């Protein structure tokens, strides 16, 4: 097994500079003269896109930015000029011999102008509410960077159990991240507690972001 | 235009069997070498099954970590690539990508969990914004409670809705995942025009249509 | 073209 070790583990450049992925080799992936090397783009939700092969030669209809280098053990993946859409994790890959395998991989970042969330909260549906459950859902929308932090309060009372925290991968084309919150709790203490809050600290604002409800409104 | 589309993924237990398959067109595929690749949030991409092109006498090839328990084929008549997998362990779980030309192209995936869990459909909720809302947007939301195995689909308007939604990735949550969904219009669109959440969760042959309804106190 | 064993394919 010829291991290959890809650093930096993410990376976050701003539009129009450079990006650069290394990716190390256990051993020599040259055969002849050619370098044995493959790099893939992968964007959240989809497969693997083919990019690069022999370490600097680029596959069909592959922009120009994207190029390779490196021989031996060790190879670069330079993206330049980063755009919008470059948003991905690359994987290195070696078909030197059997068998193949790939990098642990490198998130890419695009780095963009701060954004504050536009934060929603919802309290259960009718429907779960008589199926014995109840979640209190908060979306955290369109923010940049990734760091938030989401407290719950019920009656003014923090509380962390139950809380699930879903984050979305980087956007395409406007480079924000997103967040759900969901706080889950058993009908019967949904109904012993009236006022449900949703405090979102971020980069942007300094004090919080709260958006709240009484079940009596 | 390269098509590869994968079929028959799904749950399994320890032990079971499962046999995938994989249509491509858009190249000759009797010429073509064809692999399978599978990708777990713990082990990344792993190589699985090569077989080469009858000029190499359909020489298969395999990981360590699947020898005499997976058997690659194709059907050079029909180009079709299986994959047959017999003893399946958990550590097999991911999602099995068939690859054409190599590497060159990669199907969509298709999802293989191998879990004594038994299969559970989501509940499928309708988050509407908190009773009388104000601002020029609205935010509506969509919950999918409780499935397993991954995945489910969700689309708004049958995908109409593209621009203003962020599915977020789902968690599991007491053995369960739990899975949401926001989606932003102009305040002018709803409640006035049905919006709807649209779920299917293939592995328990669920379809589910949520409409999002106003909160009448 | 392509090779038989791809551009990603081993040499």
Redesign the interface.
Known sequence: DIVLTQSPASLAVSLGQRATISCRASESVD??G?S?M?W?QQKAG?????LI??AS?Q?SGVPARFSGSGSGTDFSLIIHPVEEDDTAVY?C?Q???????????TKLEIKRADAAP?V??????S??LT?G?A?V?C?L?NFYPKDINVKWKIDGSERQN?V?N???DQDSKDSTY???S?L?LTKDEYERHNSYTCEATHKTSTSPIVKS?NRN? | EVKLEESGGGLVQPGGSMKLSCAASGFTFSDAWMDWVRQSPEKGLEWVAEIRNKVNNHATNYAESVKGRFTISRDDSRSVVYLQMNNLKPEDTGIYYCTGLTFDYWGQGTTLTVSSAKTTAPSVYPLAPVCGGTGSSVTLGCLVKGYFPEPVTLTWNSGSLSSGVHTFPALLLSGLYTLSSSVTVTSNTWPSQTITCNVAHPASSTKVDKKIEPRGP | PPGARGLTGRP
Do not use: C, D, H, R
């Open positions: 055969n002849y050619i044995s493959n893939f989809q497969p693997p896109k083919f092969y022999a030669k596959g994987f890959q078909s030197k011999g059997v068998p193949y395998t790939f990098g642990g991989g536009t929603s909260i919802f309290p259960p549906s429907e779960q199926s459950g979640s859902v979306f929308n139950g699930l879903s984050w979305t997103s967040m759900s969901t889950t409800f409104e």
